[PDB]
């Protein structure tokens, strides 16, 4: 009898043209109800707790299972959890999952890579103040017109950010680093010396 | 939901 308030609350957001998903306007309302910027990290966290497949929509099962898992039948209970969830992102292993989730969440379904502009936007979001070289990294990619970002390069950039020194000296010129990261270093090394 | 603005202006 707990699903009662939850089913009703789902009906608030469901796409009129598809009962099995929360659509564009529904996502806009859901965010509006939470008093959050749709594009905020806080919304991203919620989707990550929902285990959402693709940005800008939730399946009827993504919403119900997710809210159920957090034990929330309202939008205030959800809000009350935000910080406890946002803090949840201190754990290194928990943040990695979130970070890697961001890739598959952000990209188009059925395509292997992530478009550059979306990747930058999502990097700014998740990796802001985690990465000393973010600004230079995005610029690097924009200037050379790499149109797409592979999963391998996305996932490993995290590890790169964790271990790279202010002067990049500890970076081994051999490495097991994906080409794109290595190119960045060979570009970025002069700019810091 | 970065793409939500573009997807609203497109629908
Ligand atoms: Br589903």
PDB file of C-alpha atoms and ligand atoms in Angstrom:
ATOM      1  CA  UNK A   1       0.000   0.000   0.000  1.00  0.00           C
ATOM      2  CA  UNK A   2       3.071   2.258  -0.158  1.00  0.00           C
ATOM      3  CA  UNK A   3       3.066   2.302  -3.980  1.00  0.00           C
ATOM      4  CA  UNK A   4      -0.251   4.208  -3.784  1.00  0.00           C
ATOM      5  CA  UNK A   5       1.220   7.706  -3.392  1.00  0.00           C
ATOM      6  CA  UNK A   6       4.024   6.722  -5.780  1.00  0.00           C
ATOM      7  CA  UNK A   7       1.814   5.593  -8.689  1.00  0.00           C
ATOM      8  CA  UNK A   8      -0.163   8.814  -8.317  1.00  0.00           C
ATOM      9  CA  UNK A   9       3.089  10.844  -8.295  1.00  0.00           C
ATOM     10  CA  UNK A  10       4.241   9.045 -11.440  1.00  0.00           C
ATOM     11  CA  UNK A  11       1.044  10.079 -13.271  1.00  0.00           C
ATOM     12  CA  UNK A  12       2.077  13.699 -12.706  1.00  0.00           C
ATOM     13  CA  UNK A  13       5.148  13.355 -14.963  1.00  0.00           C
ATOM     14  CA  UNK A  14       4.300  10.679 -17.566  1.00  0.00           C
ATOM     15  CA  UNK A  15       4.390  11.592 -21.274  1.00  0.00           C
ATOM     16  CA  UNK A  16       0.803  11.854 -22.627  1.00  0.00           C
ATOM     17  CA  UNK A  17       2.075  10.236 -25.871  1.00  0.00           C
ATOM     18  CA  UNK A  18       3.750   7.321 -23.999  1.00  0.00           C
ATOM     19  CA  UNK A  19       2.588   6.103 -20.563  1.00  0.00           C
ATOM     20  CA  UNK A  20       5.774   4.024 -20.157  1.00  0.00           C
ATOM     21  CA  UNK A  21       8.122   7.044 -19.881  1.00  0.00           C
ATOM     22  CA  UNK A  22       8.548  10.522 -18.352  1.00  0.00           C
ATOM     23  CA  UNK A  23       9.195  12.872 -21.272  1.00  0.00           C
ATOM     24  CA  UNK A  24      10.827  16.258 -21.963  1.00  0.00           C
ATOM     25  CA  UNK A  25       8.074  18.364 -20.347  1.00  0.00           C
ATOM     26  CA  UNK A  26       7.816  15.774 -17.557  1.00  0.00           C
ATOM     27  CA  UNK A  27      11.531  16.047 -16.789  1.00  0.00           C
ATOM     28  CA  UNK A  28      11.137  19.847 -16.820  1.00  0.00           C
ATOM     29  CA  UNK A  29       8.260  19.629 -14.291  1.00  0.00           C
ATOM     30  CA  UNK A  30      10.017  17.028 -12.098  1.00  0.00           C
ATOM     31  CA  UNK A  31      13.036  19.352 -11.901  1.00  0.00           C
ATOM     32  CA  UNK A  32      10.754  22.354 -11.338  1.00  0.00           C
ATOM     33  CA  UNK A  33       9.123  20.505  -8.444  1.00  0.00           C
ATOM     34  CA  UNK A  34      12.541  19.907  -6.854  1.00  0.00           C
ATOM     35  CA  UNK A  35      13.431  23.596  -7.292  1.00  0.00           C
ATOM     36  CA  UNK A  36      16.584  22.610  -9.209  1.00  0.00           C
ATOM     37  CA  UNK A  37      18.300  23.572 -12.442  1.00  0.00           C
ATOM     38  CA  UNK A  38      17.636  20.654 -14.801  1.00  0.00           C
ATOM     39  CA  UNK A  39      21.337  20.894 -15.750  1.00  0.00           C
ATOM     40  CA  UNK A  40      22.630  20.841 -12.165  1.00  0.00           C
ATOM     41  CA  UNK A  41      24.816  18.077 -10.694  1.00  0.00           C
ATOM     42  CA  UNK A  42      21.943  17.419  -8.271  1.00  0.00           C
ATOM     43  CA  UNK A  43      19.673  16.286 -11.114  1.00  0.00           C
ATOM     44  CA  UNK A  44      22.514  14.119 -12.450  1.00  0.00           C
ATOM     45  CA  UNK A  45      22.849  12.433  -9.029  1.00  0.00           C
ATOM     46  CA  UNK A  46      19.105  11.651  -8.995  1.00  0.00           C
ATOM     47  CA  UNK A  47      19.299  10.085 -12.447  1.00  0.00           C
ATOM     48  CA  UNK A  48      22.323   8.133 -11.274  1.00  0.00           C
ATOM     49  CA  UNK A  49      20.308   6.827  -8.341  1.00  0.00           C
ATOM     50  CA  UNK A  50      17.521   5.998 -10.755  1.00  0.00           C
ATOM     51  CA  UNK A  51      20.131   4.224 -12.927  1.00  0.00           C
ATOM     52  CA  UNK A  52      18.601   6.141 -15.854  1.00  0.00           C
ATOM     53  CA  UNK A  53      19.490   4.962 -19.365  1.00  0.00           C
ATOM     54  CA  UNK A  54      19.472   8.250 -21.284  1.00  0.00           C
ATOM     55  CA  UNK A  55      19.247  11.928 -20.387  1.00  0.00           C
ATOM     56  CA  UNK A  56      15.970  13.875 -20.644  1.00  0.00           C
ATOM     57  CA  UNK A  57      13.624  10.966 -19.908  1.00  0.00           C
ATOM     58  CA  UNK A  58      12.866   8.307 -17.310  1.00  0.00           C
ATOM     59  CA  UNK A  59      11.181   4.993 -17.975  1.00  0.00           C
ATOM     60  CA  UNK A  60       8.228   4.108 -15.735  1.00  0.00           C
ATOM     61  CA  UNK A  61      10.498   1.484 -14.170  1.00  0.00           C
ATOM     62  CA  UNK A  62      13.468   3.869 -13.734  1.00  0.00           C
ATOM     63  CA  UNK A  63      11.279   6.204 -11.654  1.00  0.00           C
ATOM     64  CA  UNK A  64       9.349   3.611  -9.620  1.00  0.00           C
ATOM     65  CA  UNK A  65      12.289   1.331  -8.763  1.00  0.00           C
ATOM     66  CA  UNK A  66      14.590   4.304  -8.048  1.00  0.00           C
ATOM     67  CA  UNK A  67      12.160   6.155  -5.765  1.00  0.00           C
ATOM     68  CA  UNK A  68      11.224   2.835  -4.146  1.00  0.00           C
ATOM     69  CA  UNK A  69      14.928   2.111  -3.508  1.00  0.00           C
ATOM     70  CA  UNK A  70      15.313   5.494  -1.805  1.00  0.00           C
ATOM     71  CA  UNK A  71      11.929   4.939  -0.079  1.00  0.00           C
ATOM     72  CA  UNK A  72      10.321   8.124  -1.397  1.00  0.00           C
ATOM     73  CA  UNK A  73       6.643   8.659  -2.275  1.00  0.00           C
ATOM     74  CA  UNK A  74       6.883  12.459  -2.381  1.00  0.00           C
ATOM     75  CA  UNK A  75       9.114  15.142  -3.863  1.00  0.00           C
ATOM     76  CA  UNK A  76      10.087  16.516  -0.429  1.00  0.00           C
ATOM     77  CA  UNK A  77      11.408  13.177   0.865  1.00  0.00           C
ATOM     78  CA  UNK A  78      13.471  12.993  -2.311  1.00  0.00           C
ATOM     79  CA  UNK A  79      14.774  16.531  -1.729  1.00  0.00           C
ATOM     80  CA  UNK A  80      15.531  15.685   1.915  1.00  0.00           C
ATOM     81  CA  UNK A  81      17.800  12.916   0.634  1.00  0.00           C
ATOM     82  CA  UNK A  82      19.761  14.979  -1.935  1.00  0.00           C
ATOM     83  CA  UNK A  83      22.649  15.961   0.414  1.00  0.00           C
ATOM     84  CA  UNK A  84      22.972  12.434   1.885  1.00  0.00           C
ATOM     85  CA  UNK A  85      23.201  11.251  -1.729  1.00  0.00           C
ATOM     86  CA  UNK A  86      25.433  14.112  -2.909  1.00  0.00           C
ATOM     87  CA  UNK A  87      27.769  13.364   0.038  1.00  0.00           C
ATOM     88  CA  UNK A  88      27.595   9.712  -1.016  1.00  0.00           C
ATOM     89  CA  UNK A  89      29.904  10.948  -3.804  1.00  0.00           C
ATOM     90  CA  UNK A  90      32.927  11.249  -1.510  1.00  0.00           C
ATOM     91  CA  UNK A  91      33.651   7.502  -1.641  1.00  0.00           C
ATOM     92  CA  UNK A  92      36.201   6.980  -4.421  1.00  0.00           C
ATOM     93  CA  UNK A  93      34.533   3.789  -5.697  1.00  0.00           C
ATOM     94  CA  UNK A  94      31.051   5.338  -5.536  1.00  0.00           C
ATOM     95  CA  UNK A  95      32.151   8.427  -7.455  1.00  0.00           C
ATOM     96  CA  UNK A  96      33.836   6.278 -10.157  1.00  0.00           C
ATOM     97  CA  UNK A  97      30.538   4.461 -10.788  1.00  0.00           C
ATOM     98  CA  UNK A  98      28.758   7.812 -10.974  1.00  0.00           C
ATOM     99  CA  UNK A  99      31.423   9.191 -13.305  1.00  0.00           C
ATOM    100  CA  UNK A 100      31.378   6.198 -15.625  1.00  0.00           C
ATOM    101  CA  UNK A 101      27.575   6.167 -15.514  1.00  0.00           C
ATOM    102  CA  UNK A 102      27.637   9.767 -16.794  1.00  0.00           C
ATOM    103  CA  UNK A 103      29.077   8.684 -20.160  1.00  0.00           C
ATOM    104  CA  UNK A 104      26.348   6.149 -21.109  1.00  0.00           C
ATOM    105  CA  UNK A 105      23.684   8.484 -19.643  1.00  0.00           C
ATOM    106  CA  UNK A 106      24.868  11.467 -21.685  1.00  0.00           C
ATOM    107  CA  UNK A 107      25.341   9.904 -25.145  1.00  0.00           C
ATOM    108  CA  UNK A 108      22.905   8.929 -27.929  1.00  0.00           C
ATOM    109  CA  UNK A 109      21.613   5.359 -27.774  1.00  0.00           C
ATOM    110  CA  UNK A 110      23.047   3.061 -30.469  1.00  0.00           C
ATOM    111  CA  UNK A 111      26.261   5.039 -30.979  1.00  0.00           C
ATOM    112  CA  UNK A 112      29.646   3.993 -29.599  1.00  0.00           C
ATOM    113  CA  UNK A 113      31.037   7.455 -28.825  1.00  0.00           C
ATOM    114  CA  UNK A 114      30.047  10.693 -27.123  1.00  0.00           C
ATOM    115  CA  UNK A 115      29.877  13.922 -29.149  1.00  0.00           C
ATOM    116  CA  UNK A 116      32.491  16.517 -28.140  1.00  0.00           C
ATOM    117  CA  UNK A 117      30.163  19.336 -27.007  1.00  0.00           C
ATOM    118  CA  UNK A 118      28.148  17.013 -24.773  1.00  0.00           C
ATOM    119  CA  UNK A 119      31.339  15.502 -23.344  1.00  0.00           C
ATOM    120  CA  UNK A 120      32.748  18.946 -22.496  1.00  0.00           C
ATOM    121  CA  UNK A 121      29.446  20.029 -20.931  1.00  0.00           C
ATOM    122  CA  UNK A 122      29.306  16.847 -18.828  1.00  0.00           C
ATOM    123  CA  UNK A 123      32.985  17.130 -17.864  1.00  0.00           C
ATOM    124  CA  UNK A 124      32.442  20.710 -16.696  1.00  0.00           C
ATOM    125  CA  UNK A 125      29.626  19.331 -14.576  1.00  0.00           C
ATOM    126  CA  UNK A 126      31.109  16.224 -12.919  1.00  0.00           C
ATOM    127  CA  UNK A 127      34.859  17.022 -13.003  1.00  0.00           C
ATOM    128  CA  UNK A 128      34.735  20.706 -11.999  1.00  0.00           C
ATOM    129  CA  UNK A 129      37.232  21.327  -9.199  1.00  0.00           C
ATOM    130  CA  UNK A 130      38.281  17.662  -9.331  1.00  0.00           C
ATOM    131  CA  UNK A 131      40.644  18.174 -12.241  1.00  0.00           C
ATOM    132  CA  UNK A 132      43.429  20.742 -12.416  1.00  0.00           C
ATOM    133  CA  UNK A 133      43.655  20.391 -16.185  1.00  0.00           C
ATOM    134  CA  UNK A 134      39.950  20.431 -17.155  1.00  0.00           C
ATOM    135  CA  UNK A 135      40.020  23.897 -18.775  1.00  0.00           C
ATOM    136  CA  UNK A 136      43.130  23.086 -20.793  1.00  0.00           C
ATOM    137  CA  UNK A 137      41.710  19.620 -21.608  1.00  0.00           C
ATOM    138  CA  UNK A 138      38.475  20.928 -23.123  1.00  0.00           C
ATOM    139  CA  UNK A 139      40.326  23.624 -25.072  1.00  0.00           C
ATOM    140  CA  UNK A 140      42.782  21.043 -26.369  1.00  0.00           C
ATOM    141  CA  UNK A 141      39.944  18.868 -27.711  1.00  0.00           C
ATOM    142  CA  UNK A 142      38.007  21.789 -29.229  1.00  0.00           C
ATOM    143  CA  UNK A 143      41.034  23.190 -31.061  1.00  0.00           C
ATOM    144  CA  UNK A 144      41.854  19.892 -32.803  1.00  0.00           C
ATOM    145  CA  UNK A 145      38.222  19.063 -33.625  1.00  0.00           C
ATOM    146  CA  UNK A 146      38.009  15.594 -32.114  1.00  0.00           C
ATOM    147  CA  UNK A 147      34.324  15.104 -32.943  1.00  0.00           C
ATOM    148  CA  UNK A 148      33.735  12.085 -30.678  1.00  0.00           C
ATOM    149  CA  UNK A 149      34.877  10.675 -27.316  1.00  0.00           C
ATOM    150  CA  UNK A 150      35.253   6.884 -26.795  1.00  0.00           C
ATOM    151  CA  UNK A 151      34.224   5.261 -23.486  1.00  0.00           C
ATOM    152  CA  UNK A 152      37.799   4.078 -22.871  1.00  0.00           C
ATOM    153  CA  UNK A 153      39.120   7.669 -22.987  1.00  0.00           C
ATOM    154  CA  UNK A 154      36.268   9.012 -20.799  1.00  0.00           C
ATOM    155  CA  UNK A 155      36.655   6.349 -18.091  1.00  0.00           C
ATOM    156  CA  UNK A 156      40.452   6.616 -17.894  1.00  0.00           C
ATOM    157  CA  UNK A 157      40.635  10.431 -17.756  1.00  0.00           C
ATOM    158  CA  UNK A 158      39.329  10.027 -14.178  1.00  0.00           C
ATOM    159  CA  UNK A 159      42.401   7.989 -13.229  1.00  0.00           C
ATOM    160  CA  UNK A 160      44.557  10.572 -15.038  1.00  0.00           C
ATOM    161  CA  UNK A 161      43.068  13.432 -12.980  1.00  0.00           C
ATOM    162  CA  UNK A 162      43.703  11.602  -9.706  1.00  0.00           C
ATOM    163  CA  UNK A 163      47.428  11.024 -10.239  1.00  0.00           C
ATOM    164  CA  UNK A 164      48.741  13.844 -12.477  1.00  0.00           C
ATOM    165  CA  UNK A 165      51.185  16.318 -10.883  1.00  0.00           C
ATOM    166  CA  UNK A 166      51.074  20.111 -11.232  1.00  0.00           C
ATOM    167  CA  UNK A 167      54.028  19.907 -13.650  1.00  0.00           C
ATOM    168  CA  UNK A 168      52.939  16.612 -15.292  1.00  0.00           C
ATOM    169  CA  UNK A 169      56.478  15.279 -14.644  1.00  0.00           C
ATOM    170  CA  UNK A 170      55.297  12.036 -12.994  1.00  0.00           C
ATOM    171  CA  UNK A 171      53.537  11.125 -16.261  1.00  0.00           C
ATOM    172  CA  UNK A 172      55.432   8.284 -17.941  1.00  0.00           C
ATOM    173  CA  UNK A 173      55.825   9.029 -21.671  1.00  0.00           C
ATOM    174  CA  UNK A 174      55.263   5.303 -22.302  1.00  0.00           C
ATOM    175  CA  UNK A 175      52.106   4.616 -20.243  1.00  0.00           C
ATOM    176  CA  UNK A 176      48.959   2.557 -20.886  1.00  0.00           C
ATOM    177  CA  UNK A 177      47.145   5.818 -21.664  1.00  0.00           C
ATOM    178  CA  UNK A 178      44.664   6.025 -24.595  1.00  0.00           C
ATOM    179  CA  UNK A 179      46.096   7.963 -27.557  1.00  0.00           C
ATOM    180  CA  UNK A 180      43.881  11.016 -26.944  1.00  0.00           C
ATOM    181  CA  UNK A 181      45.144  11.529 -23.391  1.00  0.00           C
ATOM    182  CA  UNK A 182      48.762  11.129 -24.546  1.00  0.00           C
ATOM    183  CA  UNK A 183      48.289  13.660 -27.358  1.00  0.00           C
ATOM    184  CA  UNK A 184      46.950  16.064 -24.733  1.00  0.00           C
ATOM    185  CA  UNK A 185      50.094  15.684 -22.616  1.00  0.00           C
ATOM    186  CA  UNK A 186      52.398  16.219 -25.635  1.00  0.00           C
ATOM    187  CA  UNK A 187      50.352  19.358 -26.335  1.00  0.00           C
ATOM    188  CA  UNK A 188      49.970  20.503 -22.713  1.00  0.00           C
ATOM    189  CA  UNK A 189      53.522  19.833 -21.427  1.00  0.00           C
ATOM    190  CA  UNK A 190      55.099  22.979 -22.980  1.00  0.00           C
ATOM    191  CA  UNK A 191      52.205  25.141 -21.702  1.00  0.00           C
ATOM    192  CA  UNK A 192      53.403  24.299 -18.161  1.00  0.00           C
ATOM    193  CA  UNK A 193      57.200  24.869 -18.276  1.00  0.00           C
TER     194      UNK A 193
ATOM    195  CA  UNK B   1      19.777  17.012 -18.243  1.00  0.00           C
ATOM    196  CA  UNK B   2      22.043  19.140 -20.494  1.00  0.00           C
ATOM    197  CA  UNK B   3      20.146  18.416 -23.736  1.00  0.00           C
ATOM    198  CA  UNK B   4      16.699  19.266 -22.252  1.00  0.00           C
ATOM    199  CA  UNK B   5      16.707  22.877 -23.504  1.00  0.00           C
ATOM    200  CA  UNK B   6      17.531  21.910 -27.108  1.00  0.00           C
ATOM    201  CA  UNK B   7      14.989  19.064 -27.000  1.00  0.00           C
ATOM    202  CA  UNK B   8      12.242  21.471 -25.823  1.00  0.00           C
ATOM    203  CA  UNK B   9      13.023  24.098 -28.497  1.00  0.00           C
ATOM    204  CA  UNK B  10      12.980  21.251 -31.065  1.00  0.00           C
ATOM    205  CA  UNK B  11       9.609  19.786 -29.961  1.00  0.00           C
TER     206      UNK B  11
HETATM  207 BR1  LIG C   1      12.758   0.081 -17.966  1.00  0.00          BR
END
